[PDB]
Design an enzyme around this catalytic site. Sequence first.
Site, PDB file in Angstrom:
ATOM      1  N   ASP A 181       0.780  -1.216   0.000  1.00  0.00           N
ATOM      2  CA  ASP A 181       0.000   0.000   0.000  1.00  0.00           C
ATOM      3  C   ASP A 181       0.804   1.253   0.000  1.00  0.00           C
ATOM      4  O   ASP A 181       0.508   2.226  -0.707  1.00  0.00           O
ATOM      5  CB  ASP A 181      -0.879   0.083   1.236  1.00  0.00           C
ATOM      6  CG  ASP A 181      -1.822  -1.109   1.482  1.00  0.00           C
ATOM      7  OD1 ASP A 181      -2.823  -1.233   0.764  1.00  0.00           O
ATOM      8  OD2 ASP A 181      -1.525  -1.889   2.403  1.00  0.00           O
ATOM      9  N   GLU A 232     -11.993   6.721   4.638  1.00  0.00           N
ATOM     10  CA  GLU A 232     -11.982   6.683   3.156  1.00  0.00           C
ATOM     11  C   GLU A 232     -13.243   7.037   2.315  1.00  0.00           C
ATOM     12  O   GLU A 232     -13.710   6.243   1.507  1.00  0.00           O
ATOM     13  CB  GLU A 232     -11.457   5.271   2.924  1.00  0.00           C
ATOM     14  CG  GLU A 232     -10.949   4.816   1.620  1.00  0.00           C
ATOM     15  CD  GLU A 232     -10.431   3.437   1.865  1.00  0.00           C
ATOM     16  OE1 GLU A 232     -11.247   2.535   1.831  1.00  0.00           O
ATOM     17  OE2 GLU A 232      -9.255   3.244   2.107  1.00  0.00           O
ATOM     18  N   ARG A 263     -16.382   4.189   4.916  1.00  0.00           N
ATOM     19  CA  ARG A 263     -16.050   2.850   5.333  1.00  0.00           C
ATOM     20  C   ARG A 263     -16.062   2.657   6.831  1.00  0.00           C
ATOM     21  O   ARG A 263     -15.256   3.284   7.499  1.00  0.00           O
ATOM     22  CB  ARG A 263     -14.684   2.529   4.774  1.00  0.00           C
ATOM     23  CG  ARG A 263     -14.050   1.215   5.124  1.00  0.00           C
ATOM     24  CD  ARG A 263     -12.702   1.120   4.442  1.00  0.00           C
ATOM     25  NE  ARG A 263     -12.172  -0.218   4.523  1.00  0.00           N
ATOM     26  CZ  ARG A 263     -11.310  -0.686   3.640  1.00  0.00           C
ATOM     27  NH1 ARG A 263     -11.004  -0.017   2.521  1.00  0.00           N
ATOM     28  NH2 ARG A 263     -10.847  -1.923   3.853  1.00  0.00           N
ATOM     29  N   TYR A 285     -12.333  -1.265  -5.169  1.00  0.00           N
ATOM     30  CA  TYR A 285     -12.800   0.012  -4.702  1.00  0.00           C
ATOM     31  C   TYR A 285     -13.825   0.639  -5.632  1.00  0.00           C
ATOM     32  O   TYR A 285     -13.927   0.338  -6.840  1.00  0.00           O
ATOM     33  CB  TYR A 285     -11.608   0.912  -4.543  1.00  0.00           C
ATOM     34  CG  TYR A 285     -10.842   0.788  -3.249  1.00  0.00           C
ATOM     35  CD1 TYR A 285     -10.774  -0.370  -2.509  1.00  0.00           C
ATOM     36  CD2 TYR A 285     -10.197   1.920  -2.753  1.00  0.00           C
ATOM     37  CE1 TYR A 285     -10.098  -0.394  -1.285  1.00  0.00           C
ATOM     38  CE2 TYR A 285      -9.519   1.903  -1.541  1.00  0.00           C
ATOM     39  CZ  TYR A 285      -9.480   0.748  -0.816  1.00  0.00           C
ATOM     40  OH  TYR A 285      -8.852   0.755   0.397  1.00  0.00           O
ATOM     41  N   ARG A 325     -14.050  -9.299  -3.042  1.00  0.00           N
ATOM     42  CA  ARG A 325     -14.274  -8.277  -4.024  1.00  0.00           C
ATOM     43  C   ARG A 325     -14.588  -8.867  -5.386  1.00  0.00           C
ATOM     44  O   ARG A 325     -13.723  -8.801  -6.264  1.00  0.00           O
ATOM     45  CB  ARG A 325     -13.027  -7.401  -4.010  1.00  0.00           C
ATOM     46  CG  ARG A 325     -12.988  -6.801  -2.630  1.00  0.00           C
ATOM     47  CD  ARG A 325     -12.099  -5.590  -2.462  1.00  0.00           C
ATOM     48  NE  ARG A 325     -11.953  -5.098  -1.069  1.00  0.00           N
ATOM     49  CZ  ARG A 325     -10.745  -4.770  -0.555  1.00  0.00           C
ATOM     50  NH1 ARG A 325      -9.618  -4.999  -1.236  1.00  0.00           N
ATOM     51  NH2 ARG A 325     -10.635  -4.242   0.649  1.00  0.00           N
TER      52      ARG A 325
END
EC number: 3.2.1.18
Lengths: 107, 389, 389, 389
Positions: B71, B198, B213, B325, B291
């Site tokens: 990240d 976020e 979130r 995302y 996801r």
Amino acid sequence: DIVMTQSPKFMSTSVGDRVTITCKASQDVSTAVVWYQQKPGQSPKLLIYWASTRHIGVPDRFAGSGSGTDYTLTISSVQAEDLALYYCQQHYSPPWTFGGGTKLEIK
Amino acid sequence: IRDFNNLTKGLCTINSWHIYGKDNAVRIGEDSDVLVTREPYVSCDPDECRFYALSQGTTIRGKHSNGTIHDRSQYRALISWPLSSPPTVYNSRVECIGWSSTSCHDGKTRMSICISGPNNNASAVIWYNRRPVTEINTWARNILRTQESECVCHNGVCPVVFTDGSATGPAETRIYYFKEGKILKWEPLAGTAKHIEECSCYGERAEITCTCRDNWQGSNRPVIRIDPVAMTHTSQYICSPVLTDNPRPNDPTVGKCNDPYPGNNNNGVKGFSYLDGVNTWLGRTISRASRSGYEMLKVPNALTDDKSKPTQGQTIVLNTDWSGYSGSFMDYWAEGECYRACFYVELIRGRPKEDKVWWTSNSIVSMCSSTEFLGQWDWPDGAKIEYFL
Amino acid sequence: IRDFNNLTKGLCTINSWHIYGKDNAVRIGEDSDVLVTREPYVSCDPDECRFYALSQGTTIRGKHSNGTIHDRSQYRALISWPLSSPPTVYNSRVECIGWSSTSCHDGKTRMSICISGPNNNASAVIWYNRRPVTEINTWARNILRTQESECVCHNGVCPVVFTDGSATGPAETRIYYFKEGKILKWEPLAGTAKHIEECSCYGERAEITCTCRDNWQGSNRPVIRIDPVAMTHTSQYICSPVLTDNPRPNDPTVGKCNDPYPGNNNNGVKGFSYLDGVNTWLGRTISRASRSGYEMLKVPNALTDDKSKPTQGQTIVLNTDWSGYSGSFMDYWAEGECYRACFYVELIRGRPKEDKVWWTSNSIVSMCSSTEFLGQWDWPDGAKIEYFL
Amino acid sequence: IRDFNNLTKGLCTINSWHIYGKDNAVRIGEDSDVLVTREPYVSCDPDECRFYALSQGTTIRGKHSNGTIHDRSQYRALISWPLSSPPTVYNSRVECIGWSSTSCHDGKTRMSICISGPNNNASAVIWYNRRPVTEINTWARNILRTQESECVCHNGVCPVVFTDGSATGPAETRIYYFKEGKILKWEPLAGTAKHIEECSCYGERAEITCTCRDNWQGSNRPVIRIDPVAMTHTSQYICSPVLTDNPRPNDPTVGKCNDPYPGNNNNGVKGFSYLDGVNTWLGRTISRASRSGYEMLKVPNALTDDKSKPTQGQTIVLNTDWSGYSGSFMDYWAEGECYRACFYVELIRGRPKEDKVWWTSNSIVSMCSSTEFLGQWDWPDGAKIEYFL
Ligand SMILES: *[C@@H]1O[C@H](CO)[C@@H](O[C@@H]2O[C@H](CO)[C@@H](O[C@@H]3O[C@H](CO)[C@@H](O)[C@H](O[C@H]4O[C@H](CO)[C@@H](O)[C@H](O)[C@@H]4O[C@H]4O[C@H](CO)[C@@H](O)[C@H](O)[C@@H]4O[C@H]4O[C@H](CO)[C@@H](O)[C@H](O)[C@@H]4O)[C@@H]3O)[C@H](O)[C@H]2NC(C)=O)[C@H](O)[C@H]1NC(C)=O
Ligand SMILES: *[C@@H]1O[C@H](CO)[C@@H](O[C@@H]2O[C@H](CO)[C@@H](O[C@@H]3O[C@H](CO)[C@@H](O)[C@H](O[C@H]4O[C@H](CO)[C@@H](O)[C@H](O)[C@@H]4O[C@H]4O[C@H](CO)[C@@H](O)[C@H](O)[C@@H]4O[C@H]4O[C@H](CO)[C@@H](O)[C@H](O)[C@@H]4O)[C@@H]3O)[C@H](O)[C@H]2NC(C)=O)[C@H](O)[C@H]1NC(C)=O
Ligand SMILES: *[C@@H]1O[C@H](CO)[C@@H](O[C@@H]2O[C@H](CO)[C@@H](O[C@@H]3O[C@H](CO)[C@@H](O)[C@H](O[C@H]4O[C@H](CO)[C@@H](O)[C@H](O)[C@@H]4O[C@H]4O[C@H](CO)[C@@H](O)[C@H](O)[C@@H]4O[C@H]4O[C@H](CO)[C@@H](O)[C@H](O)[C@@H]4O)[C@@H]3O)[C@H](O)[C@H]2NC(C)=O)[C@H](O)[C@H]1NC(C)=O
Ligand SMILES: *[C@@H]1O[C@H](CO)[C@@H](O)[C@H](O)[C@H]1NC(C)=O
Ligand SMILES: *[C@@H]1O[C@H](CO)[C@@H](O)[C@H](O)[C@H]1NC(C)=O
Ligand SMILES: *[C@@H]1O[C@H](CO)[C@@H](O)[C@H](O)[C@H]1NC(C)=O
Ligand SMILES: *[C@@H]1O[C@H](CO)[C@@H](O)[C@H](O)[C@H]1NC(C)=O
Ligand SMILES: *[C@@H]1O[C@H](CO)[C@@H](O)[C@H](O)[C@H]1NC(C)=O
Ligand SMILES: *[C@@H]1O[C@H](CO)[C@@H](O)[C@H](O)[C@H]1NC(C)=O
Ligand SMILES: [Ca+2]
Ligand SMILES: [Ca+2]
Ligand SMILES: [Ca+2]
């Protein structure tokens, strides 16, 4: 491949107690542990994913716990219908590796 | 446009979603020089819209892409490239350095905020008109973070939400109001959400709204409404039982408005929602657990009624493809009576799930509101992890 | 130009054809990063002309080019790139997503229409000034399709023809008249053609003319004349026995004006013609049977006289090289007394004919009308399918 | 800006340093086409800032990069590319040919000076508004050299320092004052420095200040202050015992103001300093012995007090990573009350130290003054010399 390790291989408690069952793995699998229960002569069923999220219709009395490499399914109020094999399964990376099961005998 | 923007319209009637733009960045990256990005967003200027994302300073195919799953590194910038072109080494413009951003245009020029540093000596620099103008140190020395999507301005004022503190605890979220780059004011999180992480935002009728979130203890979504003029704000949750965060429990028949609907712990995913009464639409992954897929569902009055269900859907991407995302954006400068509402979906690829390749990057896919009821297609990233071996 | 265009000139005297522009896209694509395109067109702005084509989201040399023979995928956009540069990953601008397009400039800015989706839930979005403004769902749920070349505007009005229904049946073609992006009006196919597919158009003296594909039962060509002002139109066939579609029967001595000249079934190829009386020119493949060569023939009065023959030719490309689609375009904004008429020729390469490579892509070649009688060259794509092995 | 610049502000309070821009040129150069550069600088226009550096006419990965350690070749130009993009074959603009440069913008357009030729018939051409306007032959036929960073203008006048003669001897340094490209005047080195090499400069309150290299006999730094109006100047040394050149002796408790502090011989490295009293900051390598690490230290009154020590630091890059040249630059055209002070650090890679690869190239890293006391990160070039093997 990740390696889901279970020990013990048999476990017993009486009716109404608590039991806890140890599933560990090779590396940090980031809570992505699934629990199944397979009762003798039955399909497995999904108890729990992300080590704590109970699936539709599994009762409050099956609790999920864990982190890093180390996970534990806890059952409470051990009913007579809870004898079965419990299986853990990694779901962090393919291939999804399962523990070898643990028999719950009710003492 | 030589004068700051005002949010003077409301949303248009969202009856289906057409395709706005999809770069095929990963399909093109097995043979052009595309940079490994993650965390995309799309934000418009009065004169063009462009995709954004955090770079990882290496191309998909070059050797340093191994490990882009991390990240945070001092090798990531916020970069833009024209709509539906790939972020390629040669067409990508750099906006500012660091690992969490948020950018938006105030009518006059654009602001861009980049956060940087180690987790306990991280720092934000607010760039405005491609010059640095303000800096912000950490107030709680634990990975100071901001939106990862378009921030929104009204009359020279653009609210940004930041969070510094843990995504497991109580963390210290703080709303800032910039104007022309300077700190006008700021506020601590006021309202009912437990933790705010976020956000993605939008603007209609002089109100900036944000869906965010709850990485701490929520499978439902804390939503922040900001009055850009009063420079004030509340937080609450989406009442609807249709849960949009992911991982998720099954959906209740009755969700909860003012506290985290519980089931999942310390995990989330960035996501959006248009909250406009009867004309509300909630995006969420098709997978409960990971996801995969992206669905848009009409759930009328979702923010308020604690017993709301879908009255209509639209699959953006199948459960048998990958998602990631998602955040919102709107062409604020676009002729008409109302605001064509839009969103993007990060298509994530590589590790940890497709672990045969040592990298992780993604694609944008993006849709905007059609009032006609258009037919639907589903929109896969498209690459075969096997041609990179 | 800050004011909409009017078609106020007529065609110039077409006495030969000079070279206007040829990208060598496939020759350059054995070593730069060129995208696999198909269906090219070329359309001008007041300020530049640029080639267009549908992309296939992959480069000639990258692994995902395998199978670009499939017409339709959710990985194709309408892209433009400067004249005679290749559509390369880095110079190509994306216009809008989907698998059939048509674009034209109204004097003020440009419109661009993209069609997308599955065959039975396909959808058109009309972009105008690089913002989406109208959407159109399918009226017959079978591969909704529009021009694949420059559409033409007069006084703010640009006719587009679309077709949805089968290219074997009766299909439902429908002419739309947009202005500034909105549906002004539309009309069902009026006149004598059986089926209308895939037109190419032009404008002279306030008339927009179109030559098209009778993929159903015609080896001659349905032609649509549109009055942009009355927003009205007819269809008919080219009378001349010189047949321009392909595959073809031999040429009759007497073709047919008002019905499909028969011989070939459910097959065609996109093609054009300038229909201007004594000064008429018909382009067609040299091959009867397949897409080889391209010839331009003066056939005076071809649209009307049912017994017309060539009085002059020009070979654009030899029968021993490959051709493909063809459509027309004109530099509407170009100083002079009349309109220099022009066309392009898609050079198709790869499969199904050169099947040793797993891809299919192409080149543009393009010519415009010279009034002097210039000498001729013939213009091969040029690549050797053997260097890609 | 249509009118020449004046230096009307002073420096802002330098309390920490934020990140301004870092290209990851070498990390991106294992897979895009980046040119091998060395000697970077960064200089702004009224409308953009851009990195600069000397090219070596070859890419990192191409075969002719072998031996780019040679400083001088007739294959090097001064090239610019947008901030934090790589100097890539395709986005890099060429400014002028030769092996030592210096460029700056006068408010109106930019000047750029390139030096070229053999060591004893070298020649400078002063380009201004991308046209050549003046040329200068060597005055001492031994590797005629100029700044390698941004030069600075006031009211149409931009001082440049040059040096020709040896970096072991007495050499003949000479300050020129250009205006619009022509030689207004020039001066021989006046003041106390023994030898002047390779300066970096800045401007505040109508004064252009420069920190330079005593490659002859100095481990401290000769500093040149120029009055752009009087077109006049002095030289002296930095009094502070904190030595910034490198290689270095240990730091004294009492350094020397008016002569070279001795210890090391015929060796240096280009470096900068902001000399502004209590608000002074000196950059230097962390290594005594080689180009490793970069530290910024507040040493109040360093230029004058011969017994000054750090009161605060900031590590730009760890001793266990590599550094190199450093020079200063400022966004002269940037709204505000004062001048945000900035610098760059050349990250050098390859030979002679990482000799497994046959090339030598680098990265920019760059910071600007934050008045808030921001946390610190350290900023590695980042490539692994092992993936180029
Ligand atoms: C041509 O194109 C048009 C336009 O695109 C097509 O029409 C659209 O087609 C859609 C598919 O039929 C249709 O969507 C559906 O609309 C209904 C309203 O009557 C809506 O309820 C549906 O929503 C559920 O369905 C999907 C699966 O199909 C779920 O994945 C989603 O979550 C919704 O289900 C969950 O919602 C509730 C709470 O969770 C529960 O009631 C339900 O049981 C279910 O629970 C599970 O799923 C959750 C996540 O998957 C999970 O969290 C939970 O725990 C459970 O596991 C759906 O949106 C559009 O309405 C329709 N629109 C229009 C204008 O027509 C048309 O069909 C195409 N035609 C042709 C010829 O191609
Ligand atoms: C220097 O350059 C100049 C300028 O470029 C050169 O002059 C040009 O050269 C051309 C070649 O000589 C010349 O074209 C011919 O013009 C005549 C008019 O008198 C025209 O009829 C010719 O058209 C036929 O010829 C080509 C083959 O050569 C065919 O492929 C084409 O279809 C035409 O043939 C078909 O047409 C009719 C109906 O189909 C039939 O009458 C005919 O039999 C034939 O049928 C078959 O072909 C069809 C398709 O191939 C098929 O469908 C059907 O079933 C049959 O199979 C041709 O255009 C130019 O007129 C001439 N122009 C000028 C200004 O001079 C010059 O020669 C060069 N000089 C030097 C030194 O290089
Ligand atoms: C969060 O971030 C903040 C903000 O970034 C952090 O605060 C900063 O942290 C810095 C490190 O602590 C701190 O720097 C130090 O400040 C003191 C002032 O009290 C200053 O003297 C220090 O300077 C020396 O230290 C470095 C090594 O650590 C040396 O490499 C450097 O040369 C300086 O040492 C030399 O200086 C003198 C003359 O040379 C001698 O007194 C000394 O002995 C030494 O000599 C040797 O080194 C030379 C080269 O290395 C060599 O030539 C000579 O021969 C000898 O070999 C240093 O700058 C910042 O002040 C501080 N700033 C602020 C606002 O707080 C914070 O700690 C971070 N916190 C967390 C939780 O992460
Ligand atoms: C924005 O709205 C404010 C009132 O909220 C007004 O004073 C201002 O001039 C407006 N600016 C523009 C460009 O609409
Ligand atoms: C990089 O990828 C290689 C294989 O391509 C892998 O073995 C290695 O551990 C990865 N990580 C690092 C830091 O090299
Ligand atoms: C186009 O022609 C119309 C009449 O057809 C006229 O009213 C209009 O202003 C013309 N526009 C331009 C730019 O020629
Ligand atoms: C792709 O090309 C390969 C050979 O390069 C071929 O064998 C394969 O069947 C093609 N199609 C697909 C879907 O892989
Ligand atoms: C620069 O300053 C001088 C005086 O030093 C003045 O005459 C000149 O016009 C100024 N130019 C600008 C643009 O400030
Ligand atoms: C170039 O590099 C090679 C190895 O890659 C080396 O052996 C050779 O001596 C180098 N220099 C020249 C001038 O070729
Ligand atoms: Ca959550
Ligand atoms: Ca036909
Ligand atoms: Ca020295």
